[model samples]
Structures are given as C-alpha cells and as structure tokens.
Target: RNRREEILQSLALMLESITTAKLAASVGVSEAALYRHFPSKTRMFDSLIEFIEDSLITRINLILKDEKDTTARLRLIVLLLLGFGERNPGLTRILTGHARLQGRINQLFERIEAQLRQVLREKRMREGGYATDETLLASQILAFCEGMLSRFVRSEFKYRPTDDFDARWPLIAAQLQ
Candidate 1:
C-alpha cells in the first residue's frame, strides 16, 4: 500500500543479493529516501523476519484448531511450512536463516518444537505404537521439517520445498513406530 510494504515485498523477492542500493533500484526510490523510512539496514531485514514469524506462527495456531491427531498435526504443520516457502520463495531464504536476521529464528523453532512435543502420548497409547521417546521423536520430526526448508533455500529455490514432502513423510513416519 505504501513504500514500507513495497520495501518489504522487494526484500522477499528472493532472487537478488538484496543490498540497500539494490532494493532502492528495484523499488524505484532514492537511497536517502530508503534510509528515511528505515534508519538502519538491519531494521529493514527485521521487518521481513517479523513478517515470516507472524505469518507462520499465526497460521500454525489455525492448524491446531482443526487437527487433533498428533501425527496428523505434525504433518499438517510441516506441510503448512513447506507450502509457505513454496508460496513465498523470498521468505524461504529467511526461514532457512541463511546468515540472516533471525534472533527470533531460534524462538520460532522452539515454538514449533513445543507444539510437536505435544506428541499426544495418551493418543499414541490409545491408538497404535509410536516412538516412546518424546524428546527424540519431537526433535527428529522438527529436524525433518527444518531440513526441508533448508533444502528449498539451498537449492536457491530451484526445487520446491513441498515437492518431496509427501513422498518423504511416509518414510520418516514408518520409522516412528
């Protein structure tokens, strides 16, 4: 709507190296003007990081409302992640934390780990067998989820993050029981 949103959008455009000058050029603004809106370059990056956290964790809460099966919950959460990256290639880079502004990055990971740790032990017992080690299982599932995002960024997003997720999830799930 405004230059602020335009600035944020260019940052998430993802194909460029993303220098301030580059951002200005892409946004059709002067360097001084860009600085006027954002006093520090780090702050600009922070906006993008904030966007990722807000968009991601907010949707995560929505998934929890609709999903009760712990196993299904993890799959949907990860699918939500991969789908986010696929939809926003630029944010995918930020998601991977590729030398990026992500102090909150660790916290976001911890948040998801906590959700996954809601491993539903009682449900695991009520239904079928699953890995009894909650800590290990949660960590492993999160790692798998994080690892997929890493791939999307690493490949410079040449490959889609969710491309192999469905095919791969079954393999990992098989190991849990």
Candidate 2:
C-alpha cells in the first residue's frame, strides 16, 4: 500500500521519461523487484485511475454537502478540477495521452460530465423560467475545462490550469444567467 504511492509519486516526478529502468533506478530497486510488486504496467495505471477518481470526487462530494447553490457548486467543480491538475501536472499528461490511456480518460471524461450534468440539472429547475438543455450546458463546461487541461499539458505545465481561473470564473458564472 505504502509502496504504491512511493512508486506512483516517483512516476509523478519523472513525467518526462517513464520506463521500467528509470522507475527502478529512482526507487533504488531492481526491475525484477518492481515486477514482483507489479506484474503489469496496466496495473500501475489502474491504481492511479483509482487515485484520480477517489481523490477528486471525494472532495467534490464534500463540496456538495455544504454548498447548495447550483452555480457555485458548478463553479467549485471546475475550480477544484483545475486545482487537481495543478497539483498533479504529470497526471494531466496521462489524461490526454496515448491510445491505451485515452480509453481510461474517455471514461473519466464521462465521469466528470456526469457530475456536471447533475449540478447543472439543478440549475435548470432553479430558474423556473428558461428551459436550458442540461446536457449541452454540462458539455460546454466539460469542454471548457478539458481545453484547460490540454493547454496545461501542452505548455509543459508552465501554464497551470489554475492560471486566471479566479478572474475568469465570474465571466463564466454570469453566463449561467
């Protein structure tokens, strides 16, 4: 259990080049030892996918308990999601990388959109006047942050996902009106 984060944390630090050799060297273990711990690279990533969802969605669930405002709930969702990226820049690369990883990300994308739809659906009922499409609104917010994650990775993390987020959020929140 402790070893998993020790290994995954090492992976975080070495986002530039990841191979079993580098991982083993950094952990000061032999490849044979690493393999004994993790049979497949897939399992290593599978572990991280759990970390990603567990880490973010738990906080997201917390926010839901305290904040009942629809717009603010949605606001905190993107805010924390980007903060999640800023904290785990290396993780963002995986979120938008290769064919194999992309499949996991595809599911993660819907996971995020599903949460967005739930909160945005609340907003639709609150207004009690204009009939906004929940799916489209959630997709728009999903696209908004997805692009931010992309840009954060493309810039080699020099441009953090949290950059301009506070200033820009009100602009976006107003649009919800």
Candidate 3:
C-alpha cells in the first residue's frame, strides 16, 4: 500500500493499540519513517477525527431535515450518536478519550458536546421554553450520555451505551419538554 493509505489502514487496525512505535512496526517501517508521512501522531489522529465527524454531520443533518419537532430531533440525534459509537468501537474510544493520552485528538470530545448543546438550545427555543436552563440542561444530558459512553468504552464495549437509552429518552423528553 501507499504510505498514506498504509498509515490509515494500519491505524484503523491498531486503533486500540495505537502508538508511534507500534504503528511503525505494523507497517514494516521505523518510527522515523512514519514521521515522514506525518510530522506527529496528532496529525494522524486528526485524519481519523475528520473522517468520523464528517460522517456524523452528514447523517445528522439528514435526520434532522426529516424531523419536525426539535425535541424528537434532539432525542434521535443523541440516540444516533450513542448507536454510532456502539458500532464504531475504535472511533468511540477516540471520541471518549481512550486515545487522548496519545494527544491525537484535539477538542473532539468538546466538539461533540458543543453539537449536543446547540441542538438542545434550538429545541428549547422551539418548544417555547425560553426561561429554562438550556445550557445546564444540555450539559446534563451530554454529561449523562458521555458518562454512559465512557463506561462502555472503558469496559471494552462489554456494556452498551444505548442500552435502555431509547426507553429512557421518553422520560428525559418529558422533563425537557
């Protein structure tokens, strides 16, 4: 494989075990050779971050376009995120800080939190609940969801994040609405 493709494919293969030395060994090259393709692990991780985020954005935009109520849209969006994480375990780890110590991701987790907050704000306004604590509400929901995701990833996906999330969303929606 070409150098770029080699890095990406190997990165995906060794997603859980990603390290400069490991990745270099996987490609039958030295650590210095990996640097020739990309200056640092941060840039390599950025490639994966961009891939996953772009995929999610397009899917979410399409889903929101078909929905009318902001609240339902928000719930579905959350469900979609959790579900997406469940399926993409490696990427899920990346999003939840499994790869953070490697310093490959930059504000990826924050970006997800921001997206959740923005939608919640829009939905709260649409529901005519102007006086409610939208920021707190968003933070609580995002925190709760991220906590669940963190547990799942930490458990090596033995526990599912979306387990009961769908059923519980109605109660959450009741409170939010």
Candidate 4:
C-alpha cells in the first residue's frame, strides 16, 4: 500500500484514542512525516471517512445492480452494512459513534440514509404500496444498523454483527413491505 493508505489504516487503528505521537510511533514515522501526507489529524480522519463511504456505497450499488427482488435488496443492504462492520471492527468505532465524539464523522450515515430512502421509495412505487412513510422507515433501519454496531463495539468486538442476521432480516424486511 501507498503511504497515504498506510497512514489511513493506522489512523483507523488509533481512532478513538488517537494522538499524533502515538499514531506516528505506530506508523514508524515522526509526527512531521505523518503531517506530510495529511496536513492535520482531522484530515487523516476525513480520508478514512472518504474511504469508508466510497467503499460501502460502491458495494451497495453492486448489490442493487445484481439483485432484482426488493426485499432481497433491502436485506442485502443491511447485511452488507453489518457484515462490513464485522470484518472491519475499526470502522465500527466510527459507525457506532464511539470515535470522534464531535459528531462530524456522521455525515457518512446521512448519505446511507438517503440511499436507503431512495430504495424504499422505488420499491413502494413499483409495488404500488403508496406508503408515505419511507423516510421514517429508512431512519428506523439505519438506527437498527447503528444500534447493532454499537452493541458489537460495546461488547469489545466479541459480539458478531451478523449473529442472527438471516432470521432478523425478515423482521426488518417485513416493515419494508
């Protein structure tokens, strides 16, 4: 990986407990060297956020493209979100709001919420369900995802996000119907 990628990976590891000295030490570089790649610690965090948003959204789009069933698409989105969080526990810190207590990092979820709402709206239109509460439903699903990640993080990473995902997804899916 390039220096920038390496720095971002290290940044994820150092998320909630970050310090320039500690991060630089973990990356085997001086703080000045670290700044050469990212002008500030916040910039480093921003880069990781960008990485996460792009990666998850891109993968979600692929799922939408490949799947035709609306229920499956919805379940896949939740599954993918939780599954990704499970695989990258560091990112879970950001997802669960355990890191960067300032709340600026939450812009990622706004984007995800929009995507979820769009999907729900389209499905409603196609099915002629005419439900006017897609926004609220989307928010609920997003909250569910965030809550699951929060539980995983609070459990010290022992709780797998997908522990009963298949069974649980239908309950979530029924709401979309």
lDDT tens readout by residue for model 3, 1-177: 367667776887677446788888888888888888778877777766765666677777876779867677778878877888787788777667775433434455566667666776776456555345767777777777777778898886788978888678987787575
Query: Which ranges of candidate 3 are over 4 A from the true structure?
Result: 1-10, 16-37, 100-106, 124-130
Tens digits of per-residue lDDT for model 1, 47-153: 66666676677887887778776667777877887788678765666667665456667776787777666644535566864646776777887787778788877
Find the 10 residues in a row with the least total lDDT in model 2: 123-132
Off by over 4 Å in 4: 1-3, 13-36, 128-132
What would the C-alpha RMSD of candidate 3 be, to one decimal place? 4.2
Q: What is the C-alpha RMSD of each candidate to the true structure, in Å?
A: 4.4, 3.3, 4.2, 3.1
Q: Which scores higher on TM-score, 2 or 4?
A: 4
TM-scores, all candidates, are 0.68, 0.78, 0.71, 0.80
Residue pairs clashing, model 1: none
Error of 4 at 16 (Å): 9.8
Candidate 1 segments whose C-alpha is farther than 4 A from its true place: 1-10, 14-39, 97-100, 119-131, 156-158
Clashes found in each candidate (C-alpha, N, C closer than 3 A):
0, 0, 0, 0
Weakest 10 consecutive residues of candidate 3 by summed lDDT? 100-109
> What value does the lDDT take at residue 173 in candidate 2?
82
Candidate order by TM-score, decreasing, is: 4, 2, 3, 1
